[PDB]
């Protein structure tokens, strides 16, 4: 999972609690 | 702990949970899988979440949401816990 990049909606909401 | 209010209560039960107070990481946690497993995400955006006619928007009082939006998301996920 790549926050500049997620391309994927869990990549978004893991991004969301960083 | 923190205590979802009665809305936020029934969305996370709904995914399996059966407790009423939470880690603020398991709220999080179990309101993603709710969107995941319940498909609200757009396929091609996948960072849009379609809340309208759902459990979800009747919490958050929106009918989308970006996930994107750090500060906002958060923002709803308080109104709806007792902290
Ligand atoms: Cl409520």
């Not at chain 2, 209010?5 to 179990?30: H, I, R, W």
Request: proline share 4%.
């Amino acid at each position: 999972c790549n926050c500049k990049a997620p391309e994927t909606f869990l990549c978004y909401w893991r991004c969301l609690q960083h | 702990l923190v205590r979802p209010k009665p809305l936020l209560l029934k969305l996370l039960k709904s995914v399996g949970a059966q407790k009423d107070t939470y880690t603020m990481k398991e709220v999080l946690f179990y309101l993603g899988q709710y969107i995941m497993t319940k498909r609200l995400y757009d396929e091609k955006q996948q960072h849009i979440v379609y809340c309208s006619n759902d459990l979800l928007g009747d919490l958050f009082g929106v009918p989308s949401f970006s996930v994107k939006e750090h500060r906002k998301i958060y923002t709803m996920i308080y109104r709806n816990l007792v902290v």
